[PDB]
Every structure is written in C-alpha cells, then in structure tokens.
Design an enzyme around this catalytic site. Structure first.
Site, PDB file in Angstrom:
ATOM      1  CD  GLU A  17      -3.080  -0.501  -0.016  1.00  0.00           C
ATOM      2  OE1 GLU A  17      -2.919   0.606  -0.576  1.00  0.00           O
ATOM      3  OE2 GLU A  17      -3.983  -1.303  -0.339  1.00  0.00           O
ATOM      4  CG  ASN A  50      -8.072   7.979  -4.933  1.00  0.00           C
ATOM      5  OD1 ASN A  50      -7.232   7.259  -5.471  1.00  0.00           O
ATOM      6  ND2 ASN A  50      -8.351   7.911  -3.637  1.00  0.00           N
ATOM      7  CG  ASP A  75     -13.059   8.978  -5.501  1.00  0.00           C
ATOM      8  OD1 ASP A  75     -12.036   9.580  -5.114  1.00  0.00           O
ATOM      9  OD2 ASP A  75     -13.541   7.997  -4.896  1.00  0.00           O
ATOM     10  CB  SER A  90     -11.784   9.745  -1.771  1.00  0.00           C
ATOM     11  OG  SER A  90     -11.228   8.784  -2.656  1.00  0.00           O
ATOM     12  CG  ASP A 147      -6.489   5.879  -1.233  1.00  0.00           C
ATOM     13  OD1 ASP A 147      -7.663   5.815  -0.825  1.00  0.00           O
ATOM     14  OD2 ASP A 147      -6.159   5.595  -2.405  1.00  0.00           O
ATOM     15  CG  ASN A 192     -11.146   6.389   0.175  1.00  0.00           C
ATOM     16  OD1 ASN A 192     -12.334   6.692   0.275  1.00  0.00           O
ATOM     17  ND2 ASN A 192     -10.375   6.838  -0.806  1.00  0.00           N
TER      18      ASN A 192
END
Ligand SMILES: O[C@@H]1[C@@H](O)[C@@H](O)OC[C@H]1O
Length: 129
Positions: free
Chosen positions: A35, A46, A48, A50, A52, A59
C-alpha cells in the site's frame, strides 16, 4: 517515517494485530508494504475527490475526514491527517475498525493483489518478535 519490515511487524504486534479477526501479522505487514512501501506519510489523491492516507492508505470517503471528500462518513472518527503520523496507532485502530465494520482484508486492494494467496509469513520471517 519509512518503517523497516521487522520494526513495523513489532509495532503492529504491540498493537495486537497478530491474528486480529483471523489475519496473521504477516498479512498486515504485507498490506503496508504494497500500500505505502512502509511510508507513514504516503498519500494518494484520487479523481473521485477522496484521498488515501498513511501507511495503510485508508480512504477519506468512509473512514477518515479530510474536509474535502464528498459523502464523508468518517467511521473511524479521526482527521485523515492523524493517519500521517510517525506513530502507527491511529492507522492500526482504524484498520481494526475497517475490519470490525464487516470488511475482510479485501478492503485493501494492494493486499488482494500482492498478499492474498502468498507466503505472508515471509514478511515477518527473521524478525525479533
Ligand atoms: O477502541 C480500541 C480499538 O481502537 C482497538 O485498539 O482495539 C481495542 C479497543 O479498545
């Protein structure tokens, strides 16, 4: 901070991740490896809206609040910036909640892709536990 493999294993074990909900310690070390490459400051923003956050790339839509993500649920009840600490406590506690909220370790794509079905014990092999 960029953790070492065995250093992270020990820290995760101190926080009770070994066998948490049936997932051996090596699963968690392996998830962090792919990760974030053990980097506590890792971020992935991201398309969208969001982002991480942290060593386990948690998220911001469901789990933490960064104030800028649509549909925020903040189920771990923490600012996302707390997941960028050199201490892994907040990330471990939220990772547990992610599982406690009905998810397996499938919730981490890097775990499915790179850890599921492999010899995850290798990621703790040779470490002082
Ligand atoms: O709330 C705590 C949770 O975050 C984790 O640490 O497991 C034990 C609980 O007391």
């Amino acid at each position: 901070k960029v953790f070492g493999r065995c250093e992270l294993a020990a820290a995760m074990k101190r926080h009770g991740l070994d066998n948490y909900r049936g997932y051996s310690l090596g699963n968690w070390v392996c998830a962090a490896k792919f990760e974030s490459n053990f980097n506590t400051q890792a971020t992935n923003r991201n398309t969208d809206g969001s982002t991480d956050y942290g060593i386990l790339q948690i998220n911001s839509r469901w789990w933490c609040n960064d104030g800028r993500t649509p549909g925020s649920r903040n189920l771990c009840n923490i600012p996302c910036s707390a997941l960028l600490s050199s201490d892994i406590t907040a990330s471990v506690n939220c990772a547990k909640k992610i599982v406690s909220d009905g998810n397996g370790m499938n919730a981490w794509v890097a775990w499915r892709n790179r850890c599921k079905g492999t010899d995850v014990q290798a990621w703790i092999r040779g470490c002082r536990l």
